[PDB]
Amino acid sequence: GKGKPRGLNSARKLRVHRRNNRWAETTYKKRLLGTAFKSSPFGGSSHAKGIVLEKIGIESKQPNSAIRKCVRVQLIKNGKKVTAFVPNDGCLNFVD
Amino acid sequence: YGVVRYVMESGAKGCEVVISGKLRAARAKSMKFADGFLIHSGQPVNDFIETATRHVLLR
Amino acid sequence: MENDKGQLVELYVPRKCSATNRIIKAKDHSSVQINIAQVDEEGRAIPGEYVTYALSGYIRARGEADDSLNRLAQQDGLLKNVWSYSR
Amino acid sequence: TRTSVLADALNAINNAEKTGKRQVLIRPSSKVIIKFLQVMQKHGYIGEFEYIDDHRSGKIVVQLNGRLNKCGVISPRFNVKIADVEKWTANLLPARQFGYVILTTSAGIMDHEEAHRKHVSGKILGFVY
Amino acid sequence: PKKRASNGRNKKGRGHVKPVRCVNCSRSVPKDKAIKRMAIRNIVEAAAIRDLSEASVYAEYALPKTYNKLHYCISCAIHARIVRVRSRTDRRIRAPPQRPRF
Amino acid sequence: EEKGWVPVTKLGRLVKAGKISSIEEIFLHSLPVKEFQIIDQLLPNLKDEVMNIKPVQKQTRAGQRTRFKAVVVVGDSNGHVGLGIKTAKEVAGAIRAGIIIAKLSVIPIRRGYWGTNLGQPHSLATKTSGKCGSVSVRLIPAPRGSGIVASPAVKKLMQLAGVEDVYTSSTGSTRTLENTLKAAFVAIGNTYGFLTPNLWEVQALTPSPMDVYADYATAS
Amino acid sequence: MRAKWRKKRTRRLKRKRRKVRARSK
Amino acid sequence: SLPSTFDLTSEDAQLLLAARVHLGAKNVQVHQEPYVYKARPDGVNVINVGKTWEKIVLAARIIAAIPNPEDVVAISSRTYGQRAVLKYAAHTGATPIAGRFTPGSFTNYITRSFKEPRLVIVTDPRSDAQAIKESSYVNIPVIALTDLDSPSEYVDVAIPCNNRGKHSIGLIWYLLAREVLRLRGALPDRTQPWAIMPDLYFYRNPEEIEQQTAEEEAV
Amino acid sequence: GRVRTKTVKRASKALIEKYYPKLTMDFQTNKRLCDEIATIQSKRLRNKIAGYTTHLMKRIQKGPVRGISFKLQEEERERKDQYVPDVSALDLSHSNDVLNVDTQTAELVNSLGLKLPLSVSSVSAVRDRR
RNA sequence: CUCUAACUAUAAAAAUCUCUCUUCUC
RNA sequence: AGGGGAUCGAAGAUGAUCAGAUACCGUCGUAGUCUUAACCAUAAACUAUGCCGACUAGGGAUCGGGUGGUGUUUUUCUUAUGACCCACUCGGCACCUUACGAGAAAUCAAAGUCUUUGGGUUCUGGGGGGAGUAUGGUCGCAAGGCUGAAACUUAAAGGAAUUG
Ligand SMILES: [Mg+2]
Ligand SMILES: [Mg+2]
Ligand SMILES: [Mg+2]
Ligand SMILES: [Mg+2]
Ligand SMILES: [Mg+2]
Ligand SMILES: [Mg+2]
Ligand SMILES: [Mg+2]
Ligand SMILES: [Mg+2]
Ligand SMILES: [Mg+2]
Ligand SMILES: [Mg+2]
Ligand SMILES: [Mg+2]
Ligand SMILES: [Mg+2]
Ligand SMILES: [Mg+2]
Ligand SMILES: [Mg+2]
Ligand SMILES: [Mg+2]
Ligand SMILES: [Mg+2]
Ligand SMILES: [Zn+2]
């Protein structure tokens, strides 16, 4: 009828088929490969401290014309460098 | 629509109203309300259909 | 259909196709109800007395309405050997 | 290859009912088909069927009366514990007031209500309503 | 999407046929997709039938015809007016354009 | 208000004469309703609710000619629903013609019992379903007082129906409101399309109201 | 671009990289 | 059941044979019609005239049951059976629709030709498909003069006869009207041949009507 | 480019269908008739109406034409319709009271339980090549 | 209710385009 | 690698068209096209529809086989064939109509018998791009084939159809 087998003794291929198909997702692949710990700036970390290296502003896309006030920060936990956003209006001067 | 309804209630064979301007928007737009039939060519335009133009001042 | 007191709660019992026993939808706008007049001894159609057959829209659309009516009229003694039960 | 013969029988019944007919010709005609149709007769979803000896697995001619609306086999005859009967009835039957999960117990092929009355349960064959 | 359930080829059960060349542009086109037109005509047209009849020995000489099956390309067939674009409900019709003359 | 309603249909003539008393006679013989005033006469208390107003545009050489599609649901919360969908220039006219169609397309529904029967039916009789576009709606009976477990539009449709408890499950692009409401309408009108053991015995085929009362039609 | 010519350009890049590796293998 | 007075009288069967009702059905056949009998070696199936007459009397029974005469509406688009329909509507209190049947004549209530009948009689389903669809949309029975080759979709009780000869259609309409009038009681007894003639329902080409007028105006 | 649009054609059609006995072949007489029996506002439209009325009258005089009808033509059509030949075209008035049927319909007559005067003739099952 | 006949025959060149999109409620 | 070597023709040689034209038009033209051995294993390798099995709807034709005709010409006096004609059946590439079924539709007689969801079974996909790329295997003389991600980026990309 359908692609999957249906017999009472076909649990093995059903399970391994689901197990091979699960890698098609992105969340499952990230969770099992554990790419968050190895590659992301934080390893499964909601927050992280860092040191401000310099004080940059980055232009927006086409439909939006402005310069969003960012800041380049080197993370202290591992040493990676990432740009970050200073959210509100007059907060750029607040962070030295 | 009340004006059109009253006019057609009076026995008229057709009424029409154009309201042009800034109808609740910055950009201009013209609304057209009509009922019956209004001719447009030949002095029947002068013999039967009578027109009126007015300006209304808003804020 | 029946409340525990025994009082009917259905809005209406629907008619059923007299040829396929399937119910007739309220908005089944293809189904028909044929009336066949009863005939007395001298061939006078007795008025107001007849027999009704409700043919569904499905068989009519399929193309078997006339055959079903043939069989149904033959069963109730209207037509003589117009329909054979063995094809 | 005809694997589940009861599947062919019930599929033929469904096709010959949806088109509105009053008869079906089921070819292979095993025990299980006979018991299934006998249960359907007992509950009225079917009319007056007939076994035609072939010396060759026989055949069956089934008479209908339009009262049925769907047969159907659960092709993997799952082992159904007495606790899971209600689960199957909820998943298959359209309402609790009627419908019957025809299932095969050690006490024969029976409708789910009768099996629950005997307090015995086995594998599931199909469903009728 | 399928513009043609027949895919234009008119093959339905062969997989591959031997291509033929276009008469105009010499396009290697499959023999079933290629449009074939049987040009049967008069070796001398009506413009000179009288002249040939008056100036020919063998009185009542049945003049010969000339036969050629032309295997057009398909771009050529659109361009050389041989075949024409049709309405989507008109593409259904495969009968030739109704006997030009009776 | 001002309403004369000269009847142009034999059904309308019979209704105006007062010869058809209940809408069940209209639904039973599958009569064709073409005058909305018949439905107004038979069901005096058909409430409505404008489900959605949608601007739909056609691209012409000059600008974009825009109309409005109104999705109106009419009913009496006692087992009668209708779903009108209309397109018109002015929104008010769109809603008027939409309610007008909805009244034309009234339909009866078969409310049933989830378990044992104690009072009036509270849910549907069986599981039902419908499909319009890619939207398939599945209505499933629910125990008493379980509410209407449905999306707001379908919930309002059931409330207009009179179904007080029901479970629902929708599959597809249920985003589009017209498709979802049409699928739900198909299901709830299919509820009277399911043969059930309590509906097996045959009846006598009572003669059609326009056969017994053909004289009062045919305005002479 | 066509997938054909993107594939061909990839093949030519592989040409250069293969000869470079072969010279240094 | 029907008294034996309603059997196939010899003269009526003779008339049915004479008008070549049976002779032609088709060189082909559709299994919706087991009205065939003894496919002729000429490849022109014969139609069981007894079955045709049973269908005729059944249709007469259906028509006579309608309490108000003018809710029987008889359609004919093809020429061969136009006049007969008119003639039928003359004797039985039916409503004719000859020539073109305007679409929307049953659904659309705004047309000035909007007739809302309780029964429709059709001379040929293949030609009057529009009338059949209109009857479908408004729950109307269709008594169609189907041939053994005409389609039987949305077609109720179907008189099996010929549609390729004017004689067959004219005489079929004769028999239908005659039996309806006998059933009603306007015609006293169902044995006398109802003196008016079968040729009254036959087709008349304008060429032959002009020829007949010329023969009439010669003196 | 004289095409005589809707108004003149419809008005002339109604004029013929309601006043054929009074209309004539002549343009001027029909012009006066149009003046008296119909209130045409202008006079150019009156003249166009009378001209098309004369044209339609001439066509009718040539013979019967589609669309328009009147009392005389409808009465003549009904009279020609009521024509029924006194002599019989059926019941074997021709062919010396003999009808020609093949074997199959003869067996039909036989099995029906009826005895009609028949004449058997084989139908030569060989079919024409057309 | 009987039927398979007429016909030809055009391919020169032509690349590119800076804004901006705006509500339907009786 | 060995054989051939006509035609046509990657490269190339030019003559034109153009602003450029080592492109399309044209004339020559090696490799190739043709083959005997040994490799290659990829194609819009397409019916873009996996295989086996059952059932569901009407209409004609067509190919292979087989049955019957009190059938027709055939001629070898008659017959036997053959060739047709009519009817039926099995199998095949197919086709027309229709929705009463299915689909987002174009459409499909299977893409039906699927929310009334289960006949058996294999392979594949989980937004687009990166990318069928890198790497690691493995096959290949080589060309390349099989297997085959991520980092990162993105709010769409895409399907069918409607009006312009
Ligand atoms: Mg004007
Ligand atoms: Mg002007
Ligand atoms: Mg395209
Ligand atoms: Mg082609
Ligand atoms: Mg093959
Ligand atoms: Mg070599
Ligand atoms: Mg070159
Ligand atoms: Mg050059
Ligand atoms: Mg070249
Ligand atoms: Mg060369
Ligand atoms: Mg590949
Ligand atoms: Mg592929
Ligand atoms: Mg992806
Ligand atoms: Mg890709
Ligand atoms: Mg590698
Ligand atoms: Mg597209
Ligand atoms: Zn070409």
Gap between the Cα atoms of H163 and H126, Å rounded:
10
The tokens for H166 are 């004017």
J22: residue with closest CA to C1': B27
Nearest to H151, CA basis, from H44, H28, H20? H28
Cα H67 from Cα H72, distance rounded (Å)? 10
The answer for residues whose C-beta is within 8 angstroms of residue G18's C-beta and 6 or more apart is none
Strands in D108-110's sheet, in edge-to-edge order, are: D108-110, D100-105, D123-128
Phi, psi of D102 (to 5 degrees): -75, 120
Residues paired with residue F121 on neighbouring β-strands, in sequence order: none
Q: Which domains does chain F have, with CATH numbers?
A: 4-108 (3.30.160.20), 109-202 (3.30.230.10)
* F160 contacts F153 by C-beta, under 8 angstroms: no
Q: Give me the torsion for CA of I44, I45, I49, I50, rounded to 10°.
A: -30
How many Å apart are CA H141 and CA F96, to the nearest integer? 35
- DSSP characters for chain F? --------SHHHHHHHHT----HHHHHHTTPPP--HHHHHHH-TT-EEEEEEEEEEEEE-SSSEEEEEEEEEEEE-SSSEEEEEEEEESSHHHHHHHHHHHHHHT-EE--EE-SSS--SS--EESS-EEEEETTEEEEEE---TT--EES-HHHHHHHHHHT--SEEEEEES-TTSHHHHHHHHHHHHHHGGGS--GGG-S----PPPHHHHT-TTSS--
Q: How far apart are CA A87 and CA A69, in angstroms?
A: 8
The parent domain of residue A88 ranges over 1-96
Give residue B42 CA to ligand 2 midpoint distance, Å.
Answer: 6
**What's the CA gap between F112 and F121, in Å, rounded?**
5
Return d(Cα E35, Cα E23) in angstroms, integer. 11
3 state DSSP class of I44: helix
Which of H136, H159, H143 minimizes the C-alpha distance to H51?
A: H159
Structure tokens, B5 = 């309804």
Diameter over CA atoms, chain C = 53
Chain H CA closest to residue F212: H67
Q: Is C20 on the interface with D (CB under 8 A)?
A: yes
Amino acid at I111: S
Q: E7 CA, K43 C1': separation in Å?
A: 19
> What distance in Å separates the CA atoms of residue D12 and residue C80, rounded to the nearest whole number?
33
Instruction: Please say whether the beta carbons of D74 and D125 come within 8 A.
Output: yes
Q: Residue C80 is encoded by which pair of tokens? A: 């003589």
Annotate F62-89 with b (16+ C-beta within 10 A) or e (fewer).
eeeeebbbbbbbbbbbebbbbbbbbebe
The rounded distance, in Å, linking the Cα atoms of D99 and D82 is 18
> What are the φ/ψ torsions at residue C8 (nearest 5 degrees)?
-65, 140
**End-to-end CA, chain H:** 55
Q: Where are the domains of chain D?
A: 1-68, 69-129
Which residues pair with residue C32 across a beta bridge? C55
Contacts across the A-D interface (CB distance below 8 Å): 7
Q: Which among D44, D66, D98 is the nearest to F196, CB-wise?
A: D98
Q: DSSP states of chain H as a string?
A: ---GGGS--HHHHHHHHHTTTTT-S-SS--TT-TTEES--TTS--EE-HHHHHHHHHHHHHHHHT-SSGGGEEEEE-SGGGHHHHHHHHHHSS-EEEES---TTSSS-SSSTT----SEEEES-TTT-HHHHHHHHHTT--EEE---TTS--TT--SB----SS-HHHHHHHHHHHHHHHHHHHTSSS-SSS--SS-GGGGS---HHHHHHHHHHHTT-
Work out the angle between the directed axes of helices H166-184 and H10-18 (0-180°, nearest 10). Answer: 150
* Residues of chain C neighbouring D66 (CB-CB closer than 8 A): 17, 20-22
In chain E, at which residue ranges do the beta strands (DSSP E only) sit? 19-20, 29-30, 35-42, 65-72
Within 10 Å of residue A16's Cβ, how many Cβ atoms?
A: 10
Listing DSSP states for chain A in one string gives --SS---TT-HHHHHHHHHHHGGGSSHHHHHHHTHHHHTSSSSS-S---EEEEE--EEE--SS---EEEEEEEEETTT--EEEEE--STT-TTT--
CA dihedral I19, I24, I28, I32 (to 10 degrees): -30
F91 token code pair: 């929104």
The residue range of the domain holding C30 is 1-87
> Scanning the structure block, which residue is given the tokens 């009627």?
D98
Token reading at F119 = 């009072």
Q: Domains (ranges, CATH) in chain H?
A: 12-207 (3.40.50.10490)
For G1-25, give the DSSP string: --HHHHHHHHHHHHHHHHHHHHHT-
DSSP E59: T
Query: What one-letter code names the amino acid at F143?
Result: P
Judged by DSSP in three states, I106 sits in helix
- Separation between Cα atoms, residue A45 and residue D37, nearest integer Å: 64
- Determine the Cα angle at H168 with ends H163 and H172, to 5°: 105
Token readout for G15 is 């040409």
- Kindly give the distance from the C-alpha atom of residue H69 to the centroid of ligand 12, in angstroms, as a whole number: 67
What 3-state class would DSSP assign to B30?
Answer: strand
* Cα C82 → chain centroid: 18
Using DSSP's 3-state secondary structure scheme, residue B58 falls into: coil
Q: Which CATH number is D1-68's, of 3.40.309.10, 3.30.1370.30, 1.10.110.30, 3.40.50.300?
A: 3.30.1370.30
> What is the DSSP-derived secondary structure letter of residue C8?
B
CATH number for the domain harbouring residue C65: 3.30.1230.20
Interface test with D, best of F127, F138, F196, F198 (most D CBs within 10 A): F196
Contact, E69 CB vs strand J, < 7 Å: no
Helices (H) and strands (E) in chain E, counts: 2, 4
3-class secondary-structure state, position B34: strand
Task: Give ∠ CA F71-F77-F81 in degrees, rounded to 5.
Answer: 45
Exposure string for D59-95, b = 16+ CB within 10 A, e = fewer: ebebebebbbbebbbbeebeebeeeebeebbeebbbb
Question: Which residue is nearest nucleotide K59, judged by alpha carbon to C1' distance?
Answer: H30
Do the Cβ atoms of C86 and H65 come closer than 8 Å? no
In angstroms, the Cα distances linking D109 to D10, D18, D22, D38, D95 are: 16, 26, 25, 10, 22
* Identity of residue E32: D
Pull the structure tokens for residue E17.
């046929």
Q: Which CATH class is domain D69-129?
A: alpha beta
Distance CA(D70)–CA(D5), nearest Å, equals: 17
I117: number of CA atoms within 13 Å, CB side? 9
Q: Resolution for this model in angstroms, one decimal place?
A: 3.3
Q: How far is CA A55 from the centre of its chain?
A: 23
Q: Please list every residue in chain H whose beta carbon sits closer than 8 Å to the beta carbon of residue F31.
A: 139
Instruction: List Cβ neighbours of D33 (8 Å cut-off, separation of 6 or more).
Output: D5, D6, D9, D26, D60
Please answer yes or no on whether D66 and C21 come within 8 Å at the CB atom.
yes
- Is the Cβ–Cβ distance between D2 and D30 less than 8 Å? no
In C15-51, which positions are buried (b, 16+ CB within 10 angstroms) versus exposed (e)? Answer: bbbbbbbbbbbbbbbbbbbbbbbbbeeebbbeeeebb
Q: What is the DSSP letter of B24?
A: S
Number of domains within chain C: 1
The full set of domains in chain E, from first to last, is 1-97 (3.30.1740.20)
Count of domains for chain A: 1
What is the rounded distance in angstroms from the CA atom of residue D76 to the CA atom of residue D7?
11
What is the residue whose two structure tokens read 């936990």? A77
Going by the DSSP 8-state scheme, the letter that residue C15 receives in this structure is: P
The two tokens of residue H146 are 């189907």
**Best CA proximity match to D22, nearest among F129, C75, F130, F190:** C75
Q: Is C14 close to F29, i.e. CB distance below 8 A?
A: no
